[PDB]
Amino acid sequence: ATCADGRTTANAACCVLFPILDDIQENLFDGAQCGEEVHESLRLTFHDAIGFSPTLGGGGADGSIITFDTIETNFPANAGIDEIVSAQKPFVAKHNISAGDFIQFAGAVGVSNCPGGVRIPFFLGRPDAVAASPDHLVPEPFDSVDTILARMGDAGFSAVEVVWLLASHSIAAADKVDPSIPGTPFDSTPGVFDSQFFIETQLKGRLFPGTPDNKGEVQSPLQGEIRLQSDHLLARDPQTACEWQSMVNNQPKIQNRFAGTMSKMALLGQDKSKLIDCSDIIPTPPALVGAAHLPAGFSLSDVEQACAETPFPALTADPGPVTSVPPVPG
Ligand code: HEM
Ligand SMILES: [Ca+2]
Ligand SMILES: [Ca+2]
């Protein structure tokens, strides 16, 4: 099909997405960069979608976090999500797709900007949100593994799927876990969708990058990197540790499982058969940059092996002395 903007797509209903793509690439993502706004937009996909429980209710990936922001903005786990909601609102107001569609579209487009990224399937047609999410459906970094897995499981995800979705933390930072050091990433390559997150979370902690005593934080192995308590525990818990380790230096697995599981997440509360497949609108991501490695100055003895069936793979360290990770600008 040929669209009003002159471009081609398989299903002509998807043409509406091309001007939206252009607008977000320029005016939300700072020229199609894998930076702060991409990261926040990706987090928003999860906070919107995970507000779904067959028991407790919630419409899932329905745009409620924007449309009912006056309610959802007050939820504890939504700390620091108000900035990206505020940034997305004028786009939702200005274009002609639902808020639920916009959130998932912006997330998929954003991931496609990141070197090593993957094209996440995208469907068009989510109805407008009808009610705010119930509170307390977003997992917290101070929740135990069993609590996190139970909540994610309630929404429909297996333990391995939780690990796959946490590849998102490869392109990610924290502003509120330790508010003294906003923009501190979870891996040494927050601009690259890669396995460094799965490697670096497996290292023995060494230091707090900022203040001590923050809820939901534990010691990190690197200055300028922050470690969530939840990620620390998920990397080591027998339910998840072998799957976590299996992501290390397996870029195709990270990509394919992230795409598939993100598609599932983007469809929480929705019925694929009542939507239109517009996956071909998502751009081709740049190739992976870099290769899997231990940080400079580290060795296998710094890895806390936690997979009972399989040893941690032999990686090479970057050359030189131990170095710090720069924060995400913004
Ligand atoms: C499984 C349980 C999870 C927990 C406990 C968790 C927790 C967190 C926390 C505490 C932050 C830092 C927020 C801040 O202080 O600014 C964060 C950031 C982030 N999370 Fe997760 N997360 C989880 C799952 C996910 C999933 C499934 C996604 C998928 C989209 C995701 C995507 C992100 C992204 C992209 C960021 C970076 C945001 C930024 O750079 O500002 N998280 N997560
Ligand atoms: Ca929602
Ligand atoms: Ca990374």
Mind explaining what this structure looks like?
The structure is a monomer. The protein is mostly helical. It has 2 domains: 11-138 and 262-289, Peroxidase, domain 1; 139-261 and 290-329, Peroxidase, domain 2. The chain is built from 12 helices and 6 strands. The strands form 3 sheets. Strands 1-6 form a two-stranded antiparallel sheet. The chain has a two-stranded antiparallel sheet with strand order 2-3. Strand 4 (217-218) and strand 5 (227-228) form a beta hairpin. The relative contact order is 0.17. Bound molecules: protoporphyrin IX containing FE (HEM) and calcium ion (CA) (2 copies).
Note the main attributes of this structure.
monomer, 330 residues, mainly alpha, Peroxidase, domain 1, Peroxidase, domain 2, 2 domains, two-stranded antiparallel sheet, globular, binds protoporphyrin IX containing FE, binds calcium ion, oxidoreductase, class II fungal peroxidases, monomeric
CATH architecture of the largest domain: Orthogonal Bundle
Determine the CATH topology of the largest domain: Peroxidase, domain 2
How far is the first residue's CA from the last residue's CA? Answer: 39 Å
Shape verdict: globular
Instruction: Identify the CATH homologous superfamily of the largest domain.
Output: Peroxidase, domain 2
How are the strands of the largest sheet arranged? 1-6
Task: Give the DSSP E fraction (strand runs of 2 or more residues).
Answer: under 5%
Secondary-structure element pattern, one letter each: HHHHHHEHHEEHEEHHHE
Instruction: Describe the main β-sheet briefly.
Output: 2 strands, antiparallel
> Would you tell me the structural class of the helices and strands?
mainly alpha
SS summary, helix count: 12
C-alpha Rg (nearest Å):
19 Å
Task: Provide the list of bound ligands, each named once.
Answer: protoporphyrin IX containing FE, calcium ion
What is the level 1 CATH name of the largest domain?
Mainly Alpha
What is the share of helical residues? 25-40%
Count of the separate structural domains: 2
- The overall strand count is 6
